Design a protein around this ligand. Structure first.
Ligand SMILES: CC[C@H]1OC(=O)[C@H](C)[C@@H](O[C@H]2C[C@@](C)(OC)[C@@H](O)[C@H](C)O2)[C@H](C)[C@@H](O[C@@H]2O[C@H](C)C[C@H](N(C)C)[C@H]2O)[C@](C)(O)C[C@@H](C)C(=O)[C@H](C)[C@@H](O)[C@]1(C)O
Ligand SMILES: Nc1nc2c(ncn2[C@@H]2O[C@H](COP(=O)(O)OP(=O)(O)OP(=O)(O)O)[C@@H](O)[C@H]2O)c(=O)[nH]1
Ligand SMILES: [Mg+2]
Ligand SMILES: [Mg+2]
Ligand SMILES: [Mg+2]
Length: 293
């Protein structure tokens, strides 16, 4: 897409943009543009990459209106939310990490060992997970009960194995995990559902100030909101995060740490399931790579 193409799309939605813009291709769902309007306001544009995304756009809009009422940190304040374009004013701080546009390598915008990141991330996790189930239900978001989690993952495994394939090693791990009763919590809570450093905004000291990408939010296993952390920060950091979260009153179980590791390891299964649901071949090919087939 050209700069002029983006200017025309934005003008079609009442947003008059300068030609000063740069592109972020990190996301699978949306191409993002850092843009600047002729009054000097910085804008974040999210342009759907696939056909048939209208419902997820309207769902994410509803999610954001729900969560902004409950969180101390900023979330995107959508002003345009058509089937063609999503736009919100840029948030205050940079994400904790970015990908290098050329190399695609992680660029860290804070010291990853920042202690403030752990304590403030614990607080944000506590606030997200505190959102009342009644409000989630009233907003027509998916609610998974504890009894739903293992049957769903088992269905996911059968579907991915049948449609794409899975290595024998990954299958064995996933089936041990599904059978390991003590790992699974007896409660579910409202979660972000795609939470990792790429979606957390912080000042340079590591104090979390915002969370961005919200289409996945629903009630589910809380460990899902810890797996992205252990994937990039490691097991001892995860242990510290769990300790800080419990200090705030976050609901835990003895095996939350172990469950989080298995959720992190289930990333390829979740990617394969997502790719199949999109029906997008390029995505399915990428998932098949991670599945070891
Ligand atoms: C550092 C940067 C890397 O991010 C991660 O590794 C984090 C830690 C994953 O979250 C991990 C951890 C966790 C908990 O998500 C936070 C888990 O749910 C997912 C499956 O895997 C991400 C984000 C996953 O994306 C998410 O995949 C979901 C299936 C759908 C979701 N979105 C489009 C709706 C999408 O953003 C997923 C599968 O790795 C994307 C594929 C394409 C990649 O391999 C890409 C190249 C990643 O390596 C990455 C972006 O470079
Ligand atoms: N600084 C800054 N970067 C942002 C902001 N919103 C999005 N980004 C960047 O744009 C990228 C893609 O935007 P997302 O909304 O995550 O796109 P997506 O397609 O939903 O992403 P995934 O579902 O994770 O694949 C993010 O990973 C950030 O690097 C923002 O408000 N500020
Ligand atoms: Mg994203
Ligand atoms: Mg049990
Ligand atoms: Mg997203």
């Amino acid at each position: 897409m050209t700069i002029q193409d983006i200017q025309s799309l934005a003008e079609a939605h009442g947003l008059l943009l300068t030609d000063k813009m740069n592109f972020n291709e990190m996301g699978i769902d949306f191409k993002v543009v850092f843009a600047l309007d002729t009054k000097g306001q910085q804008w974040l544009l999210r342009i759907p990459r696939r056909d048939g995304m209208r419902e997820q756009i309207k769902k994410e809009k509803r999610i954001l209106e729900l969560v902004k009422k409950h969180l101390s940190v900023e979330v995107p304040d959508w002003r345009i939310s058509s089937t063609e374009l999503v736009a919100y004013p840029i948030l205050k701080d940079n994400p904790v990490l970015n990908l290098d546009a050329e190399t695609y390598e992680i660029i860290w915008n804070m010291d990853k060992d920042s202690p403030k990141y752990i304590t403030s991330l614990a607080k944000t996790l506590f606030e997200i997970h505190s959102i009342p189930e009644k409000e989630v239900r009233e907003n027509d978001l998916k609610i998974m009960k504890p009894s739903d989690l293992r049957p769903e993952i088992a269905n996911n495994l059968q579907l991915v194995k049948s449609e794409i394939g899975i290595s024998e090693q990954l299958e064995t791990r996933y089936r041990k995990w599904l059978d390991n009763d003590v790992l699974w919590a007896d409660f579910t809570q409202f979660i972000h559902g795609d939470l990792y450093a790429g979606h957390v905004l912080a000042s340079k000291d590591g104090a979390v100030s915002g969370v961005i990408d919200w289409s996945t939010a629903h009630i589910d296993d809380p460990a899902i909101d810890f797996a992205g952390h252990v994937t990039l920060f490691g097991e001892e950091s995860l242990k510290t995060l769990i300790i800080e979260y419990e200090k705030l009153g976050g609901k835990v179980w003895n095996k939350l740490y172990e469950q989080t590791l298995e959720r992190a390891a289930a990333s390829p299964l979740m990617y394969g399931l997502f790719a199949l649901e999109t029906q997008n071949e390029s995505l399915i090919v990428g998932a098949k790579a991670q599945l070891g087939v």
